[PDB]
Design a protein around this ligand. Structure first.
Ligand code: D7K
Ligand code: D7K
Ligand code: D7K
Ligand code: D7K
Ligand code: CA
Ligand code: CA
Ligand code: CA
Lengths: 554, 554, 554
């Protein structure tokens, strides 16, 4: 008859279809834990709030759904800050639920109070707000969710004072609302759409770029449709890559980065259809080198700020990426009178291979396992029933080079924040989502990066999560060591060596399987053996340091 | 002639007198690393920016000096937020230098740019500011330090864009300024001072309570003079305990907490003189349970806000605590007509040691090592040559029932943040300060909290810091587990159990000495062997979970 | 028996000795108005919240006490923002009490809610906070007051939700605390003090500069004392000027600006004792031109950030300015063995006159009343029973030139914000304070500036406040017109002419006396006539535009 505010949170979460939370206990948030027990809603409790926040991200990114993080007042919240800022920059819809000091006893110098968590999250969230009344919990939870899920997706921080959670109200007087928000996005205007399609057909060498917004809606069948109908080849930033996974093979350009060569091979596009991809780091800023100044850019983004940010564009449209692709698929179901593009579709596939082979031809494995050969070993196990998470710097740069040539169930790599160490929690949340889909998660990280959340092997074991963590161990903070050397002087290395530590022993000390390997041959067996088992695994791989990936260098 | 913004920063730090930085590398801040090679200033690099921030804190606290943390753009910053908050609430002077995105290329969606780091830190720093031009560096750095070191001490964040730091200027054109800020603090008006002395002279059961501003000023000798002259017992909060270590024992009350039973037995102080003690968690808020409602209170704080925050006071003075301690000492040297107070000193001692005896009497170690028994073992090794850091909750609440009876060099416990896991980095920075004075550092932490920063074992070994890490392993997030059992029910634990992982094992995988123990005698031998060696160690002590410490039982 | 939160505010205000509020009604704050009615506490209700906020400032500045502003939710608060930011920069202690949306009905899109007033005031206040509980009102009001009153003085924003004000509690259960904070400031350390006094005596040509902090404490008798004893001549920024009013005439340097000449007349000080004066605009930044690079600066400020901000200093001391002067007066009551300084004391007075006379010699009144001659007419009525407020730009620049040569009861002019139009509310609040002291307020403003709050003649009449507003009417935004001309081109005037409007008619339409005058002779009669009456007065004075004051020019 009388229920707690924490029970209100959870009943509302359920109504929204939430099935998993990620967090770390504290008394301020106990009422949420008790309610979960009762509705049998697993809370995956980790060893650091960062890893819990990153888990929520990975789960949202892998499952294309809402991720939910739960942390307690004070240090709970401050340890979640890297996750919030990462999700903000990657545009991932996560609800961060955070405990806080009771409203009574404001300004009392009390335990875990006196920290304005809302004010700190405000610069990095789509919405940050503190609940003032137990009665408000459901409408505010549901409002927070709508803000997170709608285009562009992003993090939200709902702060729940201890007071407000512990307070009990008459359960017959309160209304748990529905989540009532169309999953069908908003589409462009038909004029704008025709105009787009007209520019499309009348042009010679066109590409589609995908951004994160395209993976969040996951309008897969509509993507292939529109692609069959038009024969326009498709590139992607990291986050869009798994969207190419169900394409006819011939028209997969893979990673947008390998669009770089196209100046030299004189085949730069005359038209780019940017769908959710933003001007900036992953798209070569406004420099011209990936997206030509001479090309006609058509850009669809839910944020009008993003439209042509760094470079003159020919048409800017505000809409939902998912809703647009759908519109594009429905419009070319009316058409079937589309130009051929044979030269181009092969001219696309051929150049991506030539770059792959140029790395392939370079790269010798004498006296040090080459980072590209490790990357290849990994690529050989990657199909649509595998999510790959990448962390590490050099590690991920090398990895990206083999990644265009495979069709993963997911690909979760660093966004604009570039924060080393987020991989562990990410992959761990990804694997929760993968479990419900039958996929399997592999984390590829550096020896620097892994040390951020290595304690998570513990969580992997307690909750029996089959993640495979592969550590590219080059005994250093590699990209940064490189920078010191190439930028400052061969003699100028400091603070970037990591010549110590047995990570597989750390993993085994936590109760997971740990392999160390230092040859191609022993790596594949370890990998195959790890894939073969339903256990958490660590694979510490010795890897050459001084090879330089393309994306540094020239 | 030509130097980087990096050298500018470093030259100014030198001029101000800093000997050690704490950090972790990034290209954005590399110019600062280089400038530290040349001037041969060590930068203790960690495995997590959080651990680095905390070390600068431990160093500032253990050595009563400025702590300097150095971190990179984006993730480097967000990982520092917790130490910053932590320093904020404990009033500890730490300069946080952070790199950020270049000012040119502002708003370009570029790597590690794109979060407003000043906006995030503003709610938890004394000052937060972004540098606009290389020529501003030395005045801005010097300003940062002044703000960090003045009363009350706290954290400062100085954001340093990549442009500013890479930019080169002719060394001739910019003057490095001096640290002009006399070290003596402001004192009370002689009329206030007299009124306080006046009150102090006519009280039957007077008491002094010290707080953190007393440890940052460290007027040990002035304090002796004044305690010796007036014969008034001294208590302290966690942060002020080492200030009681130069004092005759007949007038050490120990920790404030043990004022509890003075009311609970008809001996409540007449008059309490708070020096930097704030009203709040550590002084029993406004409850009057430690600082009684009936007593007259003279409060001396540098922040008017704190004066009588929760509870009326007789007299509120805003001044530096150290300055005030000096003033008091030297006013007290010259009026030698101070009543005896021998009785009162006795009653105060009897009650402190009654509590202690009483807990001894009821602590049985049959069936598992009792945490009070474990805390006694640590206690038998503590004096002025040892810094004790405390983390973990139940762990520090039991530990703290023994700390009154010993006289440590340092005692670094949780402030208001209450953030589990900050201990490891704190202790690491503390052990750096301690080497300057040949002291030894010991960390006493829970099995939950050590998991936050378990990877600092690697920093211990690569850096040859002989920190001894003691884990009180009760296989749970203990205090939270007790909360579930006591506030909800026996049947109602979830999320609080951690029955997995070999912590000694982890530490060994990183090259540190691991020991496992589970009795008085075995722990006693492990600790003695750990002390005998100059190597980092980890000791994992199986400790009972059931016994409730006095704190809780309120 | 049951009383409102609004009654709690007022009972607390009374206990603090508050006797006047300034504001503008709204229903959200009605409970505060009703309580005022009952305790007979005048609320001076104005025509714009800006003018009410500025009134609170002027009253605090003129009375050396707390000013209290009261404004309602939403636009009430946003119209107070210029006042808050002005008070922040001038360091004036004002409590801004603001209404806001009820806590219930947060996020309801309701009337005057949905505006985070705390977040907007946070960058410009010493403390901004929202009350969460009716029971908290007294301790929070009293805490807000202590933050405002203590060094450095500044604005505070206490936000009071409608809910919280309207809620009624048991009046027998709540404690109205006292304001318990020493009025005696904190003094320097004796070593630091002797050192200062030693540098003082051993130097040849020393000056004292005063800043606003010196007028806020108003330790007058202690100022003269220390000045007799030492014979050191005293300068002041605008805010410190009234502090020179009770000095032996021979040692009054007046406005710090006329220290400018001292390079040329080769008489730059060898020592400057900066007391509350900050490095920056009013003190010639760090350029050397007022305070010599070659001089030994001794600076006392409560803000360690301010100490040597822009220029190398010889000694930096953190303390209360008022408490220091007192310390200086008590230390030289022990001395009476002080060097003569005859050359200098005359070399001081003589150069200030020479600059006065150089303007005097220039300046012809043929076909336009000269701005300096108007300034002189005003100066001739200024003694210690007159507060002068200055607004306007050119107007105040000219005025400042006659101001060194008179002894006002107050002098309130623009601080760093330099906001045109704040004069009207300022002078109006000043006059409330002047009424209780028998003084009389004269506002000297431009024709631009007056138009900001001209509606206030209405308030002047409703509350019968004898202010005299003198409008230097030069039919333009004068300093800005000058800038366009001198900086850009004679032909390049736009947007800076104001060739229209009869201000004395506006005043008369509001029921006040209005003079227009266009000669020296007719101006003095109008002034004398206005002084002679106990009525609000407007005096529109036609004034030449193209004369250029020194402080522009060269
Ligand atoms: C060019 O900028 P850089 O400063 O070198 C760096 O930020 C970076 C980021 C992306 C790509 C390349 C380098 C990266 S690269 C880097 C070394 C990574 O070491 P790791 O062992 O994980 O992998 P590898 O390079 O050896 O494969 C570091 C420490 N940082 C800076 C950094 C520090 N702390 C945190 C939380 N995040 C960061 N990104
Ligand atoms: C009353 O609040 P509680 O929730 O019980 C807790 O916040 C606490 C309890 C008593 C004293 C101080 C803190 C503490 S106690 C606590 C258990 C820590 O377990 P650990 O194994 O380290 O030591 P012990 O208690 O077993 O000896 C946790 C997880 N929490 C909440 C919490 C979570 N995450 C972080 C970063 N900091 C925290 N304080
Ligand atoms: C319920 O709130 P109320 O306090 O009654 C008030 O806020 C209001 C009332 C009804 C509708 C809209 C606003 C309004 S109504 C109101 C009276 C305005 O008087 P006016 O002479 O302009 O028109 P009328 O009501 O006499 O026709 C005031 C002063 N206030 C509060 C207020 C103060 N300062 C500023 C800048 N904006 C405000 N809204
Ligand atoms: C050098 O900067 P300037 O831009 O000229 C200006 O800010 C200024 C301030 C102080 C001294 C001199 C000029 C001043 S001077 C100025 C003209 C003032 O006209 P007014 O009629 O009051 O007096 P006078 O100069 O004619 O005697 C203006 C509009 N402004 C800019 C301004 C605009 N709006 C507000 C609220 N405050 C301001 N200070
Ligand atoms: Ca590495
Ligand atoms: Ca534990
Ligand atoms: Ca004018």
């Amino acid at each position: 008859a009388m229920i707690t505010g924490g029970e209100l949170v959870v009943r509302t979460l359920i109504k929204a279809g939430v099935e998993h939370l990620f967090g770390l206990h504290g008394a301020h948030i106990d009422t949420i834990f008790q309610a979960c027990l009762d509705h049998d809603v697993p809370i995956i409790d980790t060893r650091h709030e960062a890893a819990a926040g990153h888990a929520a991200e990975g789960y949202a990114r892998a499952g294309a759904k809402l991720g939910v993080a739960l942390v307690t007042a004070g240090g709970g919240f401050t340890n979640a800050v890297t996750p919030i800022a990462n999700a903000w920059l990657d545009r991932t819809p996560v609800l961060f639920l955070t405990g806080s000091g009771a409203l009574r006893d404001d300004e009392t110098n009390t335990l875990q109070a006196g920290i304005d968590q809302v004010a700190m999250a405000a610069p990095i969230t789509k919405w940050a707000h503190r609940v003032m009344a137990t009665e408000h919990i459901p409408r505010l939870v549901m409002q927070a969710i709508r803000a997170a899920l709608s285009a562009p997706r992003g993090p939200v921080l709902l702060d729940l004072p201890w007071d407000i959670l512990m307070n009990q109200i008459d359960e017959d007087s309160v209304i748990i609302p529905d989540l009532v928000l169309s999953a069908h996005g908003a589409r462009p205007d038909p004029a704008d759409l025709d105009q787009a399609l007209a520019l499309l057909r009348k042009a010679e060498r066109p590409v589609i770029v995908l951004g994160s917004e395209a993976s969040r809606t996951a309008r897969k069948t509509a993507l292939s449709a529109f692609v069959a109908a038009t024969g326009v080849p498709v590139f992607a930033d990291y986050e869009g890559l798994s969207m190419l996974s169900g394409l006819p093979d011939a028209m997969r350009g893979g990673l947008v980065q390998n669009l770089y060569s196209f100046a030299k091979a004189d085949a730069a596009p005359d038209l780019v259809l940017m769908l959710g991809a933003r001007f900036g780091l992953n798209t070569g800023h406004g420099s011209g080198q990936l997206i030509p100044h001479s090309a006609q850019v058509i850009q669809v983004d839910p944020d009008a700020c993003e439209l042509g940010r760094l470079q003159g564009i020919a048409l800017g449209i505000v809409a939902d990426v998912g809703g647009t692709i759908e519109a594009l698929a429905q419009a070319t179901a009316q058409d079937a009178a589309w130009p051929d593009r044979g030269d181009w579709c092969a001219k696309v596939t051929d150049l991506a291979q030539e770059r792959y082979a140029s790395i392939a031809a370079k790269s010798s494995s004498e006296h040090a396992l080459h980072p590209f050969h490790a990357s290849q070993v990994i690529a050989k196990h990657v199909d649509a029933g595998v999510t790959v998470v990448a962390d590490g710097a050099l590690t991920y740069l090398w990895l990206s080079e083999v990644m265009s040539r495979v069709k993963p169930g997911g690909f979760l790599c660093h966004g604009y924040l570039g924060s080393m160490g987020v991989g562990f929690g990410t992959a761990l949340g990804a694997q929760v989502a993968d479990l419900e889909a039958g996929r399997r998660t592999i984390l590829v990280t550096g020896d620097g990066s892994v040390g951020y959340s290595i304690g998570e092997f513990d969580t992997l074991v307690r909750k029996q999560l089959p993640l495979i963590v592969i550590i590219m161990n080059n005994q250093s903070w590699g990209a940064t060591l490189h920078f010191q050397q190439l930028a400052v002087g061969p003699n100028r290395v400091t603070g970037t060596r990591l010549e110590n530590g047995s990570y597989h022993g750390v993993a085994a000390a936590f109760g997971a399987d740990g392999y160390h390997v230092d040859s191609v041959e022993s790596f594949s067996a370890a990998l195959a053996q790890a894939l073969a088992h339903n256990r958490p695994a660590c694979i510490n791989v010795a890897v050459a340091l001084d090879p330089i990936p393309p994306e540094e260098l020239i």
